[PDB]
Amino acid sequence: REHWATRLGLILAMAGNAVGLGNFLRFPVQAAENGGGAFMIPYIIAFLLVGIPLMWIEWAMGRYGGAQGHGTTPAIFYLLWRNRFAKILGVFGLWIPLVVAIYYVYIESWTLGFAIKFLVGLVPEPPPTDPDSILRPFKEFLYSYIGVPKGDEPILKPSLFAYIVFLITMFINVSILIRGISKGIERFAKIAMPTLFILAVFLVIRVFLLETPNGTAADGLNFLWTPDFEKLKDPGVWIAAVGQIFFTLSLGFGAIITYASYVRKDQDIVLSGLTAATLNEKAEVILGGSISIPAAVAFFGVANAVAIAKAGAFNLGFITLPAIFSQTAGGTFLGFLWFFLLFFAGLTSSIAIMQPMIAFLEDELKLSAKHAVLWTAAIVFFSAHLVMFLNKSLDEMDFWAGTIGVVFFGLTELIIFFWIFGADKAWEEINRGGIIKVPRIYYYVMRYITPAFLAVLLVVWAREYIPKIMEETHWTVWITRFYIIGLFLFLTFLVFLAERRRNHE
Ligand SMILES: CCCCCCCCO[C@@H]1O[C@H](CO)[C@@H](O)[C@H](O)[C@H]1O
Ligand SMILES: CCCCCCCCO[C@@H]1O[C@H](CO)[C@@H](O)[C@H](O)[C@H]1O
Ligand SMILES: CCCCCCCCO[C@@H]1O[C@H](CO)[C@@H](O)[C@H](O)[C@H]1O
Ligand SMILES: CCCCCCCCO[C@@H]1O[C@H](CO)[C@@H](O)[C@H](O)[C@H]1O
Ligand SMILES: CCCCCCCCO[C@@H]1O[C@H](CO)[C@@H](O)[C@H](O)[C@H]1O
Ligand code: NA
Ligand code: NA
């Protein structure tokens, strides 16, 4: 089996797994529309009671499976619990990352396309003022790029440039993945993560210098870091905070598990996993939190910045921030640096999100790495046309896989590993080879607190929020639901074929 060459490479690959579009696009929007500091108390609590313990669990399951030649949850779940239902539940550890890849890589390709256009100066001219005179040309810029519908049809018409840039983006992902773990993902992470840190630090510094009649960057830091215990009893904030923790740490994606399956059997995962987790949180709250929100608050004030964050998921990062930069000297180049930052953040995460299907094809169907990567890329590339051309298909997949799926799968993998497999054997397996030991209090968190916390959360989710999405949606969401259900059936069939290969073997 392939293995990570160096410990630093391991940590930077896992940190690039986690540090992605979630840190720089998702976190600012979720924090802003949930009260800023009101969001941070649940967020910190979720990191300590959900994020960290699940990170260790996924590292442990991955390393455990990899020692036996399996890096994905169909096989690993069965190793933990020899029951055919374990294999079926394990399909989610391929389905979730595949579905997320199908829209994540497309969004990643937007950042490359914008980076190219901002570098070359093919960007809107804001007229020398009225805020909508500033925002409108950049709103139109994004809408023409992805082809937002202008009539009543729920159809997207992305520009030719956007489509070609998606092909290029897929080619870049393949170019890394096809070289494998140590020579591909690991080598690239050692280049991309330092670049990523430097770009973000420079952007934070430039943003902190922003000052207008409406405020300063410091006003945004105060909005984000001022506790607000009013919302502390609002269910929606807790669901938001825990969803962000899952998404940003790549938990419930099967992707931490697959990366860890290339960790040598006796190599530490306690300190490694903790470091990857803490690195992501620093990049999230310090770097991600210090760019978009402080810039928007400085130029528009808090109330308008909040309204902007509530406008959409891409309004802050693809419209508002480039519009703000356009009002500064060298602002188009600053836009390029922002979108190049997002591209590298996305690329290091999308190679991680596609490696689970690659590992399954290699491990269970015994494909060569080349064939496993190309077939995975073909599946993602083909399926992405749904996200490219059907309005709000992106949203539906991000919901079932990227939002509900990861939380459900996180609870599932914990129950399998810490209840069925055995809490004491799971605890033994986590700490084996540890450079440090997991704090003892965390045994009771993982066995009792984390599962109760996630179960309560999933209950209120399905009772007080899901019915709206099941009855209050446009009919075209059934196209996307139909297709991703088909994907689950196709993957279940591949698990079936992998079973019968190992029986005829
Ligand atoms: C083989 C993939 C199955 C679906 C066929 C997709 C064909 C893509 O079609 C292309 O989309 C671009 C972006 O809007 C347009 O610029 C081009 O006019 C169009 O040819
Ligand atoms: C970004 C690296 C090169 C790939 C992008 C080049 C493909 C852009 O293609 C261009 O799109 C526009 C469509 O009207 C027009 O400029 C031209 O028809 C076409 O050459
Ligand atoms: C299945 C994925 C969406 C396919 C729509 C992309 C093409 C949109 O553009 C279409 O290109 C077609 C040929 O490529 C032509 O038949 C259409 O007349 C033309 O409008
Ligand atoms: C995977 C594709 C999801 C659905 C996207 C359909 C894009 C439709 O695209 C266009 O629609 C026109 C009607 O307005 C038709 O004349 C053309 O067939 C087609 O080019
Ligand atoms: C959700 C629980 C948050 C965990 C906070 C970190 C706990 C570290 O706390 C330490 O735990 C060690 C147990 O091994 C003990 O040796 C120490 O007495 C204690 O200080
Ligand atoms: Na992240
Ligand atoms: Na990343």
Author numbering: 5 to 132, 135 to 511
Question: Which statements did the authors publish about this structure?
Answer:
LeuT, the bacterial homolog of hDAT, has provided key insights that have improved our understanding of Na+/substrate-coupled transport in the neurotransmitter sodium symporter (NSS) family. R445 is aligned to R375 in LeuT, which forms the R375-E6 salt-bridge as part of the IC gate. Previous studies of LeuT conformational dynamics have shown that the network of interactions between the N-terminus (residues R5, E6, W8), TM6/IL3 (Y265, Y268), TM8 (D369), and TM9 (R375) are key to occluding the IC vestibule in the outward-facing occluded (OO) state.
First, we determined the effects of substitutions at the LeuT residue corresponding to R445 of hDAT, R375 in LeuT: LeuT R375A, LeuT R375D, and LeuT R375C. In all structures (superimposed), L-Ala, Na1, and Na2 (purple spheres) could be modeled into their respective binding sites (left). These crystal structures showed that R375A and R375D substitutions in LeuT precluded salt bridge formation between R375 and E6, and between R375 and the backbone of I184 as was also observed with Rosetta modeling in Figure 4A. In addition, K189 moved towards E6 by 3.4 Å, reducing the distance between residues K189 and E6 from 8.0 Å in LeuT WT to 4.6 Å in LeuT R375A (middle bottom), in agreement with Rosetta modeling. The distance between residues R5 and D369, and between residues E6 and I187, was conserved in all three structures (right bottom), as also found with Rosetta modeling. We found that both neutralizing and acidic substitutions at R375 likely promote the dissociation of the E6-R375 salt bridge (closest atom-atom distances: WT = 2.1 Å; R375A = 5.4 Å; R375D = 4.2 Å), weaken the interaction of R375 and I184 (closest atom-atom distances: WT = 2.5 Å; R375A = 6.0 Å; R375D = 4.7 Å), and decrease the thermodynamic stability of LeuT (Rosetta scores: R375A = +4.4 REU; R375D = +5.6 REU relative to WT). The substitution R375A increased the probability of an IF conformation only in the Apo (black trace) and Na+/Leu states (blue trace) (right). We have previously shown that other mutations associated with neuropsychiatric disorders (i.e. ΔV269) that disrupt this IC network also bias LeuT to an IF conformer, impairing transporter function. It is important to note that in the Apo conformation R375A does not alter LeuT IC gate to the extent of R375D. Finally, in the EC gate, R375A promotes longer-distance components sampled in the Apo, Na+, and Na+/Leu states.
